[PDB]
Each structure stands twice: as C-alpha cells, then as structure tokens.
Amino acid sequence: DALGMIEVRGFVGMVEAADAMVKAAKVELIGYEKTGGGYVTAVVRGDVAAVKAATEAGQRAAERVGEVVAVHVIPRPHVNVDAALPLGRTPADALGMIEVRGFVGMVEAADAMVKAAKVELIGYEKTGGGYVTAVVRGDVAAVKAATEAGQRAAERVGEVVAVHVIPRPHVNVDAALPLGRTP
Amino acid sequence: DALGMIEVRGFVGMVEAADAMVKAAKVELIGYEKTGGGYVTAVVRGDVAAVKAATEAGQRAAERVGEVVAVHVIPRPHVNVDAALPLGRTPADALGMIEVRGFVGMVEAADAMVKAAKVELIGYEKTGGGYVTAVVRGDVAAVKAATEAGQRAAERVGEVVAVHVIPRPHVNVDAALPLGRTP
Amino acid sequence: ADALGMIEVRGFVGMVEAADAMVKAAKVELIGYEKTGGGYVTAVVRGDVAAVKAATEAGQRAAERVGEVVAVHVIPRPHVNVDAALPLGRTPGADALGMIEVRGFVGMVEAADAMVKAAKVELIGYEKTGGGYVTAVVRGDVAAVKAATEAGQRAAERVGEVVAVHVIPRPHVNVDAALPLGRTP
Amino acid sequence: ADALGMIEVRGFVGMVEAADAMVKAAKVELIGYEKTGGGYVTAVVRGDVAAVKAATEAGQRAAERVGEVVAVHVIPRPHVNVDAALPLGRTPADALGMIEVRGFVGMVEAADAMVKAAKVELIGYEKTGGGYVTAVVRGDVAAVKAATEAGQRAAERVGEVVAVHVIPRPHVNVDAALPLGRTPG
Amino acid sequence: ADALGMIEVRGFVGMVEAADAMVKAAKVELIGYEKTGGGYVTAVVRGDVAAVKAATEAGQRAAERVGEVVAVHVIPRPHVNVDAALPLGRTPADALGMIEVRGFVGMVEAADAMVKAAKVELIGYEKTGGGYVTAVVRGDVAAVKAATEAGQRAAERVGEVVAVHVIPRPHVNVDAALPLGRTP
C-alpha cells in the first residue's frame, strides 16, 4: 500500500491533520509516532489516489492550527521499510483540545473548561519537550464555548500553543488516538 | 482542597520551590510531574489561604536557583479535574544537588562531590531535554563542601544549570520526591 | 442544568426585538424580562448550549439596529447557586406589534395619539422602564402599525426625545406570553 | 432625641463599607438604609452626638476607597417633626464579598464566576435603581477574596464594573439591618 | 500552630491604633505588645493565615494615619522553636484618648490640659523609651474627643508632639492585652 505522513510540533495540529485526512478520502489512520520534543507524526495508509488527496487536505487544514514540520507521500514503500519501521503494515461526540508548553498552564486551562460547560476531561497527552495537551469531549457548542473560555484563562499563566475544536471527529480518529473514545 | 503549582525548567529549582512551600505554610506536596524537555512541576495542596501564602514563598526561593516558568493557584478545582489529572486527589540528612545540561558534566560533578567529603550519591534524575541532576546526601558540613568542589570541577566540562544545598529538607520532600531518603 | 442567554438593552423596544429574534432563531424559551431601572431591561432565554448561543448572536444582530445594546453574554452551564438566588426561570418554584420609546411622558402621549389616528391600531397600554423612559405599544395589521409608527415617530420628534421605533410583523407566541404586549392569553 | 448620621453613596457597595466602618468606630445603631433610586443609597445611624460625629468621619474616609460619596452630614438634635415623617428608625461571623455592576448581565456573570472559583454562597442580589445591581456572596475570608477577584475579572469583559470590595468580619449590627444573607431570623 | 502577625511603630499611639484596627477587621487575637526601647513597639496578633493577613492590611492603613510605621509582616506557620523562645502568646466600654510627646515636660502639660478640658480620667502614662512618653485618658466619647484637642494645642507650645489619636469604642481585646486603665 501507499504511505502518507504529516509531522507537526504540536499534538493539536496533528489531530486536526489526521481528522482532515480520513475525511478527504478513504484512508486508514494506523496511529501516531511520538519522536519527543513536542513532535508527533500522523501516519495514514491506502492507495496512491486516496493518500495523495488526503495528504493535501490534511496539510491544508493543519497549517491553520499548529506548526507544520514535514509533509510527504510515498507511493510504494519498499518491503524493507515496512519490516523495520512502525507504519501499521509490519508482520462520536465533539472534540476540544488545548496545547500549552507548560503543565501549569494546561491545568488552569482544563479547570476553566469543565467549569464553563458540561464537558468531560478525558485526560491529557504529553508529547515531550514540555508540551502537554488537554482533551475534552462533549457537544459541539459545549466544547466550543469551553475551549474559548479555557484559552482565555490559560494565556495569563503559560505559553499557549494551539486551540482547536473538531465537531464530528471521524471514527478513524477516535480509534487510533487516545481521545477517550477508544474501542 | 486548593491547588498550587510551580513549574521550573530545572529539577534543582523545583526541589527548592517544594522545600520552601511545605516550610512556609500547612500544605501537602503530592508529588511532581515531568513534562519532558527539562520541565518539572511541583504540586501542593491545602486550604485557599495556606496555598497562596506558600506558593509565593516557594516562588521567591525558586527564582534564586532555577528558571521559573509558571506559578499559579487554583482555589476550588472542579471534581472532574482531579479525576483525570495526577494532582494527588485521585479516586534528616542534608541535600546537595547539581544540574547539568550534559551527562558528561554531571558525572564529573558527582565524582568530585564524593571525593571532596563523605557524601552518598543516591542516584541521578533525568528530566529530559539533556537535563540531568546529581543528588548527594549526608550531613550539612559534607554536602556544603562537596557541592562547592563539585561545582568548580563541573564548569570545566559541561553546561552547569544550577547548584543548591538544602541543610534540613522538610519531611514531606523526602516522601514525595526520589531523593534517596524515602521511608 | 439548562443553558442561559441574556441581552441587556437601555430601551424596552430594543429588548423586545432582541427577545423576538432569539425565540425565532432556535429552540429557546423566553423566561421573562428583568427591569433594573433607569431604562435598563434584560431579556433572558434558556435551553441548551447549541440553541442559546445561536439565538443570542441572532438577537444581538437584530437589536443593534433599533436600540442601544449594553451587554450580551451566554453562560453554558450556570451554577446551581445562581439559579437558586436569581430569577432566571429555573428555580425551586398573531397581531402585529408597534412600539415607540420616548424619554419623556409627554412625547409618548403625542406619539400614541398620532398612531391611533393614522391607521386602525389598538393602543394596548404603555410600559415604564424607569429613568423617564416610557414605551407605547400598539397592535393591529402589519401594514397598519407600520404606517402608524412612522406617523407617530414623525409627530413625537417635534415634542420630546425619541429613542427607538420598531415594528414586529408576526411576534412569536413566546413573546406575547412572557411580555405585556396586550396579547397575553 | 438621639443624634442623626447619614452617608449617601451612589453605589450599594460603598454604602455597606460606610455602614460597617460606622458601627465599628463608635457605638451607634444602624437603623437601615434608604433607597432614593438611580443607585443612590443612604446609610442611617443614630446615637450620641459625639459617637455619631466620630463614626460619621470614620465611615466617610473608609467609603471613599470604594464608591462615590455624595453627601455626609450629622444632625446633633433632630426635630421631633423629622423623626415622625421620615423613616429614620426612631419613628413612634461570615466574610462578605460584593460586586456592583451597572448592568444585570454583568452582575450575573460576576456571580457565576464567584461561586465556581471558591467555596462561597450567593445569598442574592440588590437593586439600587438606575441600572445598578450588586451581587452579594458570603463565606470564608480566604474564599470570598479569591472569589471576588476571579468574579471581578470575569465581569470586566462583559459589563461596567462599579465597585468591588471584601469585608472579612462584618459587624453584628450590619447583618441585622442590611439584606446580606446573614439576618438572624 | 496559629499564624503570626506583627506591626512595629515608632510610637505607642500608632501601635494601639494599629492593634485596635486589627482585632476589628478580622478574627484575630491580640496577645500583647513588645517594647524594644527607643520608642519602638510591636503589636502581635495571632489567628489563621487568612484572617491575620486580612487584619494586617487594615492595621497598616490605620497606623500610617497616626504613627510612623516601621515594619509590617506576617508569618504563616511559625516554627515550634519560635513560639517557645519568643513571647508570642503561644508558649506551652469607655473612650480612649492618647497624646505622645518625645519629652516628659510636654506630656505633663498635655495631661494637665486634658483633665482640665472635660470630665476624663488620667489612668497614667506609658514610657516607650528614648524620651517617648504617652499620656492615656479615658471617659465618655464627648469628653475624650474634646480633651485631646485641648491637650494637643497646649502641648505643641511646650514640646515635640509625635501623635494624637482618639478611639471612641476600643475593642474588648485591646483593653485586655494593653495597659489602658480598663483591664479587669
């Protein structure tokens, strides 16, 4: 199969990139690779027609949220590549996310989010390099009013990286990413 | 209960911050969080008045040694925050520390400390991003002369971050932090 | 725990139009209006976060065209203590619409006399929001109150300080049920 | 005839701080407060000519740090006709947090952010007229301090904040004549 | 143990006014006062961290109006060794009129003018050290308010007046911990 990868210094920009890829065409999100220092990589698999059309729509939507690093599509990876590297071929409710380069700024953001609307804080993701991401789930208008109220309280504490809301995250996103809706 | 957090890019600045908090007011150090890249966060809990009086007292002492990132107090955290985040509420010998952004500079620092006086190298703490901290224990006279001799021998090798000595660490510090004196 | 939506207007006319645009935008219930004096009035609607937030945006956009808007805010999940001590409707307990507001009782009487003489409208009474602000309310046909308010405004401008003039062709059922507009069951 | 002391403040918060400083300076009885509308409120105390004179001065200096002081006067021996026709009283603890906003919407957001920030109880609201509304919360001195500070900030982005003050230990005579949620009875 | 609150003023009048404003502002206990000589005195209150810090901010603004404040500090949790070795209280109403003068002659003339003005009682005088003395009188609010105004005007023509203040109704905790002639 073909290979598509998107790397973002920010867990929020990678989830938005992974969400836009599975919605653009019929591709499978095999998971995400964490290389430390706040860097994460979304990996999708499929045929050349879908993975190349999904990669364009994924990068186009990730540039508006996070810090895009690299974007590339491999039409036919060599058999040795899949054998030694984890690319997934080796032998729901709304989504609200806030990423802060600082654990203190992320806790204050999560505290103001659950106080604003009736949303559920499923946990937090640590991508290394001081980057932490708070993840909440709920209705579409609940998480929108929660992230905007949480970002406002966290800007006075730490360095806010990215804030995004996905109204209808694809089922492929909730399965491969730890977003509280895993099977 | 209230919530108090102090984030420092440096393991030495966090220990001095945690030591100054439990000594100033009546709060409990529930532990510490390592977000990677050298970032660490001391988390204390108590009443609204004691946490505020201790958080600034620990911030004023932490600015003398390390780079303080964020300092914040949450009076009444929501019950959903404590359920999904490691904030403690989920359903004596002297201390000598030397932090170096380099493993080579830390080993020479630890080697010069145990040779200057009679101290015990209980181990080393890896906070990420190349930051490592050598921890020695003993009486006040030894760790005072050990760190001073270890600091002079470490500057000629690597990038020294912080050097500090706590004569009598509070009993709450040795319980929640890996400093070789855990009951 | 329902949602909360509020729109405060220093004018009874702008508040009624704001309350009419909210119940028409989405599925929200107008629990009533709060009079704080000095002409300040606050329309309060409740429901879920999706309908309340979408109604206040449509209410503010239609209220800025007729009156002076003070503040517009939405609380998605109010605390239980807020609903227990303040009247937000959650507690332990179609004729056309023509309105003219004047800071002065004399200017309102002249406006009311010019409206009933211009077309076939019924002066149901007047509303006092305090601070010298009064509002005349007439009901009738959509074109009757339309030609009456434009004639009542033109005659009141020569007497007192005219604040706002607006016409609602078909007010929502929730509007007449919670507001004293002469068509309350 | 007992003496008469009055302090008028265009703001409910400044009048409460004035009343708290008067009963703590000398021994005077807080008979109540007179609401003349438009945000103007007048605290009335009575006692000896010297006790009222000293409390009148101490209350004014403390009330200037929060609200707008309108008039401050002391009558040594009021006429019998004055007490008969005017409600002047002789007609024959828990911490306190207060936020006053010219706007009902700004006061609701201030109260909603206070009960969520710390362990405080919203006892209700006070309407002084002219669009002035005051949110009153009670609780611990550490709680109401962290609550009013978080409530004042969250309300400045909504409405026009008038005054914000915190009384750690209000006098027993204040909670008896003023509606602060701690009236014994 | 409990929290600690201290206000130091170079003047016995500024300290009593500070101590009176603290016990009225929050729930704190005035354990007494400390005299370090040279006109320096320190009022010591104790309670919880929130009340002591809230009472200390009110005692400072009231003391700056009268006396020359020197130090204002609060200790949240004092060590056990501190309470055992230092006199900090944890070792296991009529009107008030005061006139302070850096001179014994000016204090006697002020005390003579106070008792001659109205019906007040001269309970005695407090020697702060370094030439500082304070005359204390009690009585009703009408007499004490007029006695100090007549005493200050007669004391400025004699010596160096430091501070003059009147407390209409001093707190019960003040008369119990300070020698103000009304201690039971």
> Tokens for C103?
């800071």
Chain B residues lying within 8 Å of E76, measured CB to CB? 24-26, 50, 53-54, 57
Q: Which residue of D has its CA nearest to B79?
A: D116
CB of B17 within 8 Å of any CB in chain E?
no
User: Does B63 contact D at CB distance below 8 Å?
Assistant: no
CA separation for the pair D5, D74 (Å, rounded): 5
Spatial distance between the Cα atoms of C15 and C11, rounded to a whole number of angstroms: 6
- CB contacts < 8 A (A, C): 26
Q: How many residues does chain A have?
A: 183
Q: How far is the C-alpha of E47 from the C-alpha of E74, rounded, in Å?
A: 11
What is the secondary structure of C47-88 as a DSSP string? E-HHHHHHHHHHHHHHHTTTS-EEEEEEESS--HHHHHHS-S
Cα separation, D86 vs A114, whole angstroms: 52
Cross-chain Cβ contact D140/B76 below 8 Å = no
Can you spell out the DSSP letters for C162-173?
EEEEEEESS--H
Q: What does this entry list as its resolution, in Å?
A: 3.6
A168 and A111 belong to one structural domain: yes
- For the beta carbon of residue D70, count every other beta carbon within 10 angstroms: 17
**Three-state DSSP class for A154?**
helix
Q: Specify the DSSP class assigned to residue D180.
A: S
Number of domains within chain B:
2
- Among C2, C27, C28, C49, the residue to mutate for chain A (most A Cβ within 10 A): C49
From the list D104, D115, D130, the residue facing C8 with the nearest CB is D104
C32 φ/ψ angles, rounded to the nearest 5 degrees? 140, -170
Phi and psi angles of residue C79, each rounded to the nearest 5 degrees, phi first:
-70, 155
Residue D150 at interface with chain B, using a CB cutoff of 8 Å? yes
Chain D: closest CA distance from residue C12 (Å):
13
Domain end: B33, B61, B91, which one? B91
Which DSSP symbol is given to E22?
A: H
Q: What is the 3-state secondary structure (H, E, C) of chain B?
A: CEEEEEEEECHHHHHHHHHHHHHHCCCEEEEEEEEECCEEEEEEEECHHHHHHHHHHHHHHHCCCCCEEEEEEECCCCHHHHHHCCCCCCCCCEEEEEEECCHHHHHHHHHHHHHHCCCEEEEEEEEECCEEEEEEEECHHHHHHHHHHHHHHHHCCCCEEEEEEECCCCHHHHHHCCCCCCC
CA distance B21 to chain A (A): 16
Residue B167 phi/psi, 5-degree rounding, is -65, -55
B4 and B68 assigned to the same domain: yes
**What Rg, from alpha-carbon coordinates, does chain B have?**
16
Can you say how many angstroms the Cα of residue A4 is from the centroid of all Cα atoms in its chain? 15
CA distance D114 to D96: 12
| Residues listed for chain B | 183
Residue E65: burial class (beta carbons within 10 Å; 0-12, 13-18, 19+): middle
Q: Is D146 on the interface with B (CB under 8 A)?
A: yes
Nearest-5° Cα angle at E43, E40 to E47: 155
- Calculate the alpha carbon distances from A170 to A41, B176, D84, E27 in Å: 18, 41, 77, 58
- Tokens for A38? 């706040």
Report the alpha-carbon distance of residue A117 to residue C3 in Å, rounded.
9
Do E54 and D25 count as a contact with CB atoms less than 8 A apart? no
Let me know whether A138 and A180 are in one domain: yes
Q: Which of D54, D145, D168 sits opposite E168 (nearest CB)?
A: D54
User: Could you tell me where the beta strands, DSSP code E, fall in chain E?
Assistant: 3-9, 29-37, 40-47, 69-75, 95-102, 121-129, 132-139, 161-167
The type of residue at B161 is: V
Residues A180 and A150 in one domain: yes
What residues of chain C lie within 8 A of the CB of A165, using their CB?
none
Question: What 8-state DSSP symbol labels residue D90?
Answer: -
Is the same domain home to D115 and D153? yes
Q: Tokens 């992230």 appear where?
A: A147
Same-domain status, A83 and A99: no
> How were these coordinates obtained?
X-ray
> Which chain B residues contact residue E2 at CB under 8 A?
none
Three-state DSSP class for E158?
Answer: coil
Measured distance CA(E137)–CA(E181) in Å, rounded? 8
Residues B6 and B49 in one domain: yes
Q: How many residues does chain D have?
A: 185
Residue where one domain finishes, among candidates D41, D61, D92: D92
Residue C72: list chain A partners with CB under 8 A.
Answer: none
Q: For tokens 């009443």, what's the residue?
A: B47
Do E5 and E81 belong to one domain? yes
> Which two tokens mark D92?
């024959």
Taking alpha carbons only, the member of B87, B82, B28 closest to residue B54 is B28
Site of tokens 């499923």: A122
* C7 and C59 both lie in a single domain: yes
Put simply, whether D73 touches B (Cβ < 8 Å) is: no
The CA distance from C46 to C32, in Å, is 10
DSSP E123-145: EEEEEEETTEEEEEEEE-HHHHH
Number of H helices and E strands in chain A, helices first, is 6, 8
- Which of D115, D124, D133 is opposite residue C36, by nearest beta carbon? D133
The 10 Å Cβ neighbour count of residue A2 is: 19
Structure tokens at D39: 């945000």
Residue numbers preceding breaks in chain B (C to N > 2.5 A): 91
CB–CB contact A117 C77 (8 Å) = yes
Please indicate, yes or no, whether residues E101 and E144 belong to a single structural domain of this protein: yes
Residue E147, amino acid: A
User: Cα(C63)–Cα(A147) distance, rounded to whole angstroms?
Assistant: 27
Phi, psi angle pair for A76, to nearest 5°:
-140, 95
> E48 at the B interface (CB within 8 A)?
yes
d(CA C110, CA C160): 9
Query: Alpha-carbon dihedral of residues D117, D118, D121, D122, nearest 10 degrees?
Result: -20
CB within 8 Å: D168 and E141: no
C72 touches chain D (CB under 8 A): yes
Kindly list the strands in the beta sheet with C40-47, ordered across the sheet, starting from the edge strand earlier in the chain. C29-37, C40-47, C3-10, C69-75
Contacts of C50 in chain A (CB under 8 A): 139-141
Are A126 and A179 contained in the same domain? yes
Last residue of a domain, one of A39, A66, A91: A91
Same domain, E11 and E83: yes
CB contact under 8 A, D104 and C34: yes
Residues of chain E with Cβ-Cβ distance to D140 below 8 Å are: 50
Q: Measured between alpha carbons, how far is D147 from D165 in angstroms, rounded to an integer? A: 11
CB atoms near residue E12 (< 10 Å)? 28
Domain that holds residue B53: 1-91
Chain breaks in chain C (C to N over 2.5 A) after: 93
Distance of alpha carbon D12 from alpha carbon D15, whole angstroms: 5
